[PDB]
């Protein structure tokens, strides 16, 4: 859980 990193992919 962040906002800077990509959750998917």
């Amino acid at each position, epitope marked *: *859980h*962040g*906002q*800077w*990193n*990509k959750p*998917s*992919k």
Partner: antibody, heavy 118, light 107 residues
């Protein structure tokens, strides 16, 4: 072998527009979130916005939303930051930082010094 | 949301232990990184997810929360540690950086 190489420093006239670049190397750019950070001379870092090159979905900081327009070209493996109606307040160095899936794989670009002058 | 980084400036001897704090204004959880800007302009993130150290960053660098106060700590200060440090929060938009801390070395 993987890095973010930014376009060269440049001068631009006021009222004009510029299109900074950030080419990813050693990995496919859509496998990450690409952020854009600004830094006015003798000042602190500021977040401009971030792009999901996969679909081009962009999120911005309130103050930059009426001037910035981030985009990308999956094939060219590059992310661009486009600034319109340039002024003296836009003279600063712009950095592109990677927001990879594996958080441990994040790194930044050297920066692109942009001077806005007559 | 306003990250209040303190102190603005800090002069410390070598070997010494320093701590830089950032007071989260509206609670951001575990989403707070620490980046370091060397004199030459280059940027490198030291701490991520509040306490987890990135690759290669030396053992003397640590991160830890304590209420609404997040802090970066250097157990023993070295010459190569001279730089500017900023705390980044990536919880709510717009993402925020602290005012930064200019770390000078007593010699």
């Amino acid at each position: 072998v993987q890095l973010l190489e930014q376009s060269g420093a440049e001068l631009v006239k006021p009222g004009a527009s510029v299109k900074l670049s950030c080419t990813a190397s050693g990995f496919n750019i859509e496998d990450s979130y690409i952020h854009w950070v600004k830094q006015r001379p003798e000042q602190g870092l500021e977040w401009i916005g971030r792009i999901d090159p996969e679909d081009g979905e962009t999120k911005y900081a309130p103050k930059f939303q009426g001037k910035a327009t981030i985009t990308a070209d999956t094939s060219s493996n590059t992310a661009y930051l486009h600034l319109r109606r340039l002024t003296s307040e836009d003279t600063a160095i712009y950095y592109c930082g990677r927001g990879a899936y594996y958080i441990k794989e994040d790194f930044w670009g050297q920066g692109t010094t942009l001077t806005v002058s007559s | 949301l306003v990250m209040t980084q303190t102190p603005s400036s800090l002069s410390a001897s070598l070997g010494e232990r320093v701590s830089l704090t950032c007071r989260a204004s509206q609670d951001i959880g575990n989403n707070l990184n620490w980046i370091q800007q060397k004199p030459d302009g280059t940027i490198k993130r030291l701490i991520y997810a509040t306490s987890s150290l990135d690759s290669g960053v030396p053992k003397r660098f640590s991160g830890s929360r304590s209420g609404s106060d997040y802090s970066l700590t250097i157990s023993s200060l070295e010459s190569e540690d001279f730089a500017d440090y900023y705390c980044l929060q990536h919880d709510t938009f717009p993402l925020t950086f602290g005012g930064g801390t200019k770390l000078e070395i007593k010699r």
